[PDB]
Amino acid sequence: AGLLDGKRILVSGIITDSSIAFHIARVAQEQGAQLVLTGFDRLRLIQRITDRLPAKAPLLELDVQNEEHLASLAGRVTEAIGAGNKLDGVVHSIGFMPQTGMGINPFFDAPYADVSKGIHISAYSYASMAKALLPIMNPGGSIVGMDFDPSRAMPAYNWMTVAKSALESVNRFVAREAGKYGVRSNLVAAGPIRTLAMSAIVGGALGEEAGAQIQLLEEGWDQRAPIGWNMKDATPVAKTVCALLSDWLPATTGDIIYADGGAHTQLL
Amino acid sequence: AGLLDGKRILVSGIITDSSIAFHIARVAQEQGAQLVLTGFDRLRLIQRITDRLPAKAPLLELDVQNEEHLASLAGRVTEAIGAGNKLDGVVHSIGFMPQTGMGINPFFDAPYADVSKGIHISAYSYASMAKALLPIMNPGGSIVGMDFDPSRAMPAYNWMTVAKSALESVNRFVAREAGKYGVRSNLVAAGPIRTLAMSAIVGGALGEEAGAQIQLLEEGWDQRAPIGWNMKDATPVAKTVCALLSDWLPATTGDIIYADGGAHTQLL
Ligand SMILES: NC(=O)c1ccc[n+]([C@@H]2O[C@H](COP(=O)([O-])OP(=O)(O)OC[C@H]3O[C@@H](n4cnc5c(N)ncnc54)[C@H](O)[C@@H]3O)[C@@H](O)[C@H]2O)c1
Ligand SMILES: NC(=O)c1ccc[n+]([C@@H]2O[C@H](COP(=O)([O-])OP(=O)(O)OC[C@H]3O[C@@H](n4cnc5c(N)ncnc54)[C@H](O)[C@@H]3O)[C@@H](O)[C@H]2O)c1
């Protein structure tokens, strides 16, 4: 087969080989997709990493907070997939929040600026990628972003939770605009995954207490999941994003798909 | 009686005599509350207006985006309610979004800056008022903000809907912090009210199309409300905020109370 046979998907947000984008990309490729990657600030590093990928892919630099990068994106993508072709899928796997809006530092103490940097990169950027790529997408195209159920407060993820609730609200508006092009836009809500970043944190980088709390959120997750939750295998999330990028979920947009072991549907 | 007998509530967000804060304030007063008001930029105007209020109240200037105003707030409030006393309620009835993130101008075209100004004043400010006043609140105190169900996209309210979803997420975090002081924090989701601002808009200030859309959202509202919805009487919203400020809803925080005629519970 190739669930994504002959499709053209752009993928963003690869840093290390434990980035969730990294896995989405790998599975996408085993699934016949043909990619184009974007990276942020360590390009040679992302470059080196991305080679272990099952197959080659052009890599474009893109700082989601950069006007030009954005203005030039579609141009650059077409040079690479080559003129005459369009995108079938776009993945927004990116996000960020200053240390101050998140860890240990109390909720009221994060200054708006940091918080705004956060919302800029984490939520607003979904809109900007859309606006930039939509003109080059085929109908039936699919835009997907990564979420973390912000629907109930929790410790430590402070303002980042605020930025995900804002992201979920942007998705519904992006869905309205994308539909005029025949394109879907949805999010995926993942359970906690031991990414590099997370590791450092349960490892005590945002402070001891923050770490202990995450660590506990993490264990509550697998207890509650009727099918369990393994924080060290991003696989089950990759596959979902893949399902969404394909043609099998054709009537769903401005929506959230929970890839979290069923944890959110159980109280305890 | 005096539902709010001998309570001390601070009230913000009065501009004209059609501001929702204006009514909350009036009903609060008929209910025995003793207020302190904050105003923004037209102080003499707010001053003049506030005199028609059923009773006198000190007015303090406060631009929610001003570090000092904020640092000095509690000082100023105590000078006025007078040393030895504390606040029992605080009302956040304020909000704003640049013309560019809202009306007619397409969703993707609002620049982050305007959008950020919006989120600053509209959502983040709930956190900052909290942080500023909590140290002076009595236990059993109640903080309340005004919401507009952002839970499903709609036309024209573009980024302002995004800012309300972010507000609802902040409320849950403010609720976590307030509880350590014995204080509740909730929001109120109102139906559309013919405030000055709104008028101008259904009147075609944000463009014709924006106006026509609101106008229709407005009429869908009363059809759906099993008990109807009158956009020209803010009364039923005042009363609710009042219920929340009192002691009759003592076990509810980080929550949303719908004061919207029951519209949100019906499909059509
Ligand atoms: N790890 C989790 O437990 C978890 C759970 C659910 C959802 N998510 C989301 O998955 C997404 C990917 O996170 P990850 O956990 O794989 O982390 P990750 O740290 O590997 O990747 C996040 C990406 O954001 C990029 N970034 C920061 N600023 C940027 C900018 N200006 N322009 C472009 N890229 C920028 C980084 O290069 C990085 O590739 C995030 O949105 C995260 O919120 C993660
Ligand atoms: N009118 C509606 O149909 C409707 C519906 C539901 C919820 N709400 C909310 O009710 C709240 C009050 O709105 P209103 O409709 O009564 O409008 P209004 O325009 O009379 O008042 C909003 C207030 O925001 C203040 N403002 C702007 N920037 C400020 C700043 N930097 N510092 C302090 N104040 C600032 C203004 O002075 C004004 O008093 C808003 O949050 C609005 O979103 C309104």
**Three state DSSP letters for chain B:** CCCCCCCEEEEECCCCCCCHHHHHHHHHHHCCCEEEEEECCCHHHHHHHHCCCCCCCCEEECCCCCHHHHHHHHHHHHHHHCCCCCEEEEEECCCCCCHHHCCCCCHHHCCHHHHHHHHHHHHHHHHHHHHHHHHHEEEEEEEEEEECCCCCCCCCCHHHHHHHHHHHHHHHHHHHHHHCCCCEEEEEEECCCCCHHHHHHHCCCCCHHHHHHHHHHHHHHHHHCCCCCCCCCCHHHHHHHHHHHCCCCCCCCCEEEEECCCHHHCCC
Is B148 in CB contact (< 8 Å) with chain A? Answer: no
A-B interface: how many C-beta pairs under 8 angstroms?
82
Q: Which residue has the tokens 């059609």?
A: B18
This structure was determined by X-ray
- Of the CA atoms within 13 Å of residue B221, those in its CB half-sphere come to 21
Q: How far is residue B237's CA from residue B188's CA, in Å, rounded to a whole number?
A: 8
Sheet containing B87-92, strands listed edge to edge, beginning at the edge strand earlier in sequence: B59-61, B34-39, B8-12, B87-92, B137-147, B184-190, B255-259
Do A178 and A253 meet the contact criterion of CB atoms below 8 Å apart? Answer: yes
- CA–centroid distance, B15 to ligand 2, in Å, is 8
Tell me the Ramachandran region of residue B20: left when phi exceeds 0, alpha when psi lies from -120 to 50, beta otherwise.
Answer: alpha
Chain centroid to Cα B66, Å, comes to 18
Q: Which atom of ligand 2 is nearest to the CA of B193?
A: 3
Find all residues with CB under 8 Å of A153, minimum gap 6, and list them.
Answer: A161, B169, B172, B173, B175, B176, B254
Contacts of B45 (CB under 8 A, 6+ apart): B15
Q: Is the dihedral of CA A74, A80, A83, A85 positive or negative?
A: negative
- Subunit contact A127:B107, Cβ cutoff 8 A: yes
Q: ∠ CA(A135), CA(A139), CA(A142), 5° rounding?
A: 85
What whole-number distance in Å separates Cα of residue A57 and Cα of residue A54? Answer: 10
CA A241 to ligand 1 centroid distance, Å: 15
- Contact (CB<8Å) B166/A165: yes
| Helices B112-119 and B158-179, packing angle to 10 deg | 40
Which uninterrupted H or E stretch holds A139?
strand A137-147
Closest chain A residue to B173 measured between Cα atoms? A153
Angle at A192 between CA A186 and CA A193, to 5 degrees: 95
Hey, what are B220's tokens?
């869908």
Read off φ and ψ for residue B23, nearest 5 degrees.
-70, -35
**If we measure between CA atoms, which residue out of A17, A35, A140, A162 comes closest to residue A91?**
A35
The single residue listed with the structure tokens 């990068």 is A69
Do residues B186 and B252 make contact, with C-beta atoms less than 8 angstroms apart? yes
Give the Cα separation of A260 and A151 in Å (integer): 14
- Residue A70, classed as helix, strand or coil, is helix
For β-strands A184-190 and A59-61, DSSP reports them as: unpaired
Phi and psi at residue B10, to the nearest 5°: -105, 140
Q: Which residues contact A46 (CB under 8 A, 6 or more apart)?
A: A14, A15, A37, A39, A40, A59
Please give the distance, rounded to the nearest whole angstrom, from the Cα atom of residue B241 to the centre of ligand 2: 15
Phi, then psi, of B91 in degrees rounded to 5: -110, 125
CA dihedral A153, A155, A157, A163 (to 10 degrees): 20
Kindly give the interhelix angle for B125-133 and B158-179, rounded to the nearest 10 degrees: 20
With residue A208 as reference, give the H or E element that holds it: helix A208-224
Do B106 and A172 count as a contact with CB atoms less than 8 A apart? no
Q: Quote the CA–CA distance of A236 and A255 in Å, as a whole number.
A: 19
SS3 A249: coil
CB B149: neighbour CB atoms within 10 A? 18
Placement of tokens 């959008």 in the chain: B115
- What are the angstrom distances between the C-alpha of B13 and each of B17, B101, B184, B189? 11, 21, 20, 16
Contacts for A201 with CB less than 8 Å, ≥ 6 apart: A103, A210, A211, A214
Cα-Cα-Cα-Cα torsion B257, B227, B247, B25, nearest 10 degrees, comes to 90
Q: How many CB atoms lie within 10 A of CB A195?
A: 18
- C-alpha of A8 from chain center: 17
CA–CA separation, A216 vs A212, rounded Å?
A: 6
Place of tokens 């159980």: A266
Residues contacting A48, CB < 8 A, separation 6+: none
Most ligand 1 atoms within 8 A of CB, residue of A10, A14, A16, A20 to mutate: A20
**Which residues does residue A10 pair with via DSSP β-bridges, in sequence order?**
A36, A90
Angle at which helices B235-245 and B20-30 cross, to 10°: 60
Q: Which chain B residue has the Cα nearest residue A150?
A: B169
Q: Does residue A44 sit in helix, strand or coil?
A: helix
Ramachandran bin of B6, using left for φ above 0, alpha for ψ from -120 to 50, beta for the remaining angles: left
Name the DSSP letter for residue A134: G
- Of the residues B109, B131, B154, B165, the best mutation for testing chain A's interface (the one with the most A CB atoms within 10 Å of its CB) is B165
Pairing state of beta strands B8-12 and A255-259? Answer: unpaired
Q: Going by C-beta distance under 8 Å and a sequence separation of 6 or more, which residues neighbour residue B8?
A: B33, B34, B35, B36, B81, B85, B86, B87, B88, B89
Q: Do A120 and B116 touch (CB under 8 A)?
A: yes
| Cα radius of gyration (chain A) | 18
Cβ pair A218, A195 in contact under 8 A: no
Strand order in the sheet with A59-61: A59-61, A34-39, A8-12, A87-92, A137-147, A184-190, A255-259
Residue (of A73, A81, A97) closest to A8 by Cα position = A81
Q: What is the DSSP string of A145-173?
A: EEE---SS--SS-HHHHHHHHHHHHHHHH
Contact A25/A37 with Cβ under 8 angstroms?
yes
Which has the closest alpha carbon to B146: B191, B94, B97, B221? B94
Which tokens in the block code for residue A236? 């089950």
Output the CATH code of domain B1-268.
Answer: 3.40.50.720
- Comparing CA positions, the residue from A118, A108, A93 lying closest to residue A195 is A93
Phi-psi region at B263: left, alpha or beta (left = phi > 0; alpha = psi -120 to 50) = alpha
Testing the interface with B: which of A100, A112, A149 to mutate, by most B Cβ within 10 A?
Answer: A112
Asked whether B147 and B187 are in contact (CB, 8 A), the reply is yes
Q: What residue ranges do the domains of chain B occupy?
A: 1-268
Q: Which of A124, A147, A151 should one mutate to test binding to chain B, selecting the residue with the greatest count of B CBs within 10 A?
A: A124
Question: Looking at chain A from residue 96 to 135, which residues have their Cβ under 8 Å from any Cβ of chain B?
Answer: 106-108, 112, 115-116, 119-120, 123-124, 127-128, 130-131
What is residue A101's DSSP assignment?
Answer: G
Report the distance separating Cα A106 and Cα A86, nearest Å: 46
Residue A164 labelled as part of a binding site:
yes
CA atoms within 13 A on the CB side of B260: 24
Do residue A177 and residue B123 have CB atoms under 8 angstroms apart?
Answer: no
Classify burial at A138, counting beta carbons within 10 Å of its beta carbon; exposed 0-12, middle 13-18, buried 19 or more. Answer: middle
- At B153, the amino acid letter reads A
Which two three-digit tokens encode residue B256?
Answer: 């949303």
Amino acid making up residue A27: V
Report the alpha-carbon angle A250-A254-A255, nearest 5: 80
C-alpha span between A240 and A255 (Å, rounded): 14
State the ligand closest to the CA atom of B62.
2
CB A134 within 8 A of CB A181: yes
Cβ distance of B131 and A112 shorter than 8 Å: no
